[PDB]
């Protein structure tokens, strides 16, 4: 989109209000002297689907992280390793999920998620859509979604 580059990452205040309007949240905090914002709540992919607890934090100049705390993804989802049960940067006990393509792979220089976009507008639907394919994998046996995955020789990771 051809727009002016004068646009810069917004202050914490604008997305402070945005997440409150949509859905119920048990907590929403300002931590580290206006540095980091935290959000928690319950997200349901489908009508017959399970109940999921999601935690999200952000800091200016750093990519967001999304972690599903409760449940444990249905007991790690019966061994295998795809649902990304990860250390999660060592402060939240849950699986950390990837939601967008990192900037390095993008040639144009614009990431799929940028500081212009809010958190609730895209990241929350991304997490819910990820959870939908996660629960569908348990039945189908294949990731019938975006099948992007590199090999360790060809891998390039931003995390």
């Amino acid at each position: 989109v051809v727009i002016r580059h004068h646009c810069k990452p917004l202050t914490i205040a604008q997305q402070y209000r945005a997440l409150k309007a949509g859905g119920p949240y048990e907590r929403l905090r300002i931590i580290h002297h206006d540095r980091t914002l935290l959000w928690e709540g319950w997200l349901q992919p489908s009508l017959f689907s399970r109940r999921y607890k999601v935690a999200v934090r952000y800091s200016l100049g750093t990519p967001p992280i999304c972690v599903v705390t409760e449940p444990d993804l249905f007991a790690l989802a019966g061994t295998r390793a795809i649902p990304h049960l990860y250390p999660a940067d060592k402060h939240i006990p849950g699986a950390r999920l990837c939601l967008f393509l990192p900037r390095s792979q993008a040639d144009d220089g614009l990431s799929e998620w940028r500081a212009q976009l809010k958190i609730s507008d895209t990241l929350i639907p991304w997490a819910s859509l990820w959870l939908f394919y996660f629960e569908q994998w348990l039945h189908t046996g294949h990731w019938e979604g975006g099948g992007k995955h590199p090999r360790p020789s060809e891998v390039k990771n931003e995390r």
Binding site: G23, L43, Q44, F48, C98, L99, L129, E135, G146
Partner: protein, 374 residues
């Protein structure tokens, strides 16, 4: 968790899943035209004969074909189509004359001669790989008044027994035409109900033993029971918005319609009295008949229990497993594939919106392009 206590949205989703599953079981209209033309040509051939007794033969559909309740057989390529000839001139004609007249001419025609295969109660034509035609010769019946179809058919034991096919069809068509009252909010339905029940019975009978399989419920008894139950729930004026609750209520009301009189159980044609569809149930040589009345009640219990289990499903994986267990794997695969294609297009179209309350997916805020590494 019971089926009745669920919210109406989940319950509507269950109803839609069952209906879409049955949609693949039914035969299309092009095939129906093919069968219709086939037996029309057979009847036109029959009319061309010089034989006086066979003259004026008339061919009309019967059974699942007439009532628009065709469900494709499981693991069978060939559908079942049944037909009956009408002979106005054979009011007093014998078995041998009509049977020979049909047989020799079916052997005469170049196309029909090879595919012909004899049956104890009639003749069959084996169109290879797609469907069949079933023919039963019958003479007219006089003495009792009806919408018009009192007729005899052929059985080895008595050579003529009463049957009234057309009246049942008109009764079913008139009954299924009415729609139940619907609450004000800010193929007929009965045909779908009977088709779902027949699919459930077909898949249920497989797991049973030889005795239960040979004594499984037949289509006409279930059809007339469901029709009577639907008729009373229409007359009772009860408001119906809970979807599979309609199946639960109808199947509840079916066993009450079985009538026991002087040790004889009569499930009758409402138009023609003397033919018991439960005539197999009544006769009890070596407990063959009593076992037939059992299978209906075990099927009643199982069909009432299955929607309790599907109601108890949590997660999208377990719902598909329950539907695969109750309604066949092959029909279920297509529904899930079409759903996934639809929502993939919704991603591509951009119609995937976010629910404000639960954040659930809406398939019709468009989700931007995204990549998920597994």
């Amino acid at each position: 968790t019971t089926a009745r206590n669920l919210p109406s949205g989940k319950k509507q989703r269950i109803a839609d899943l069952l209906s879409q599953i049955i949609e693949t079981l039914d035969l299309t209209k092009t095939q129906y035209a093919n069968i219709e033309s086939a037996y029309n040509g057979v009847g036109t051939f029959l009319s061309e004969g010089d034989d006086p007794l066979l003259q004026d033969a008339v061919i009309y559909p019967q059974g699942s074909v007439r009532l628009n309740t065709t469900v494709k057989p499981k693991n069978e390529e060939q559908y079942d189509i049944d037909l009956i000839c009408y002979l106005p001139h054979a009011t007093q004609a014998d078995y041998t004359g009509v049977i020979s007249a049909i047989r020799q001419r079916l052997e005469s025609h170049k196309t029909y001669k090879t595919l012909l295969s004899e049956l104890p109660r009639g003749f069959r034509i084996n169109y290879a790989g797609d469907y069949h035609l079933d023919i039963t010769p019958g003479r007219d019946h006089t003495g009792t008044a009806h919408p018009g179809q009192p007729l005899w058919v052929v059985d080895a034991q008595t050579a003529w027994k009463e049957s009234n096919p057309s009246g049942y069809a008109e009764w079913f068509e008139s009954s299924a035409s009415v729609q139940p009252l619907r609450t004000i909010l800010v193929k007929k339905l009965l045909n779908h109900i009977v088709q779902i029940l027949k699919r459930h019975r077909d898949e249920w009978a497989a797991e049973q033993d030889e005795v239960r399989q040979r004594c499984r419920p037949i289509s006409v008894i279930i059809t007339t029971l469901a029709c009577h139950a639907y008729n009373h729930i229409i007359a009772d004026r009860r408001a119906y918005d809970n979807d599979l609750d309609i199946l639960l209520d109808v199947l509840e009301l079916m066993p009450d319609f079985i009538v026991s009189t002087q040790g004889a159980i009569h499930v009758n044609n409402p138009h023609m009295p003397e033919e018991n569809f439960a005539e197999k149930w009544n006769r009890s040589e070596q407990d063959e008949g009593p076992q037939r009345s059992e299978a209906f009640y075990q099927w009643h219990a199982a069909a009432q229990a299955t929607f309790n289990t599907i109601a108890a499903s949590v997660g999208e994986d377990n719902l598909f497993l329950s539907l695969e267990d109750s309604f066949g794997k092959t029909p279920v695969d297509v529904v899930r594939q079409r759903l996934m294609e639809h929502m993939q297009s919704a991603r591509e179209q951009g119609s995937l919106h976010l629910d404000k309350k639960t954040g659930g997916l809406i398939a019709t805020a468009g989700v931007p392009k995204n990549t998920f590494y597994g």
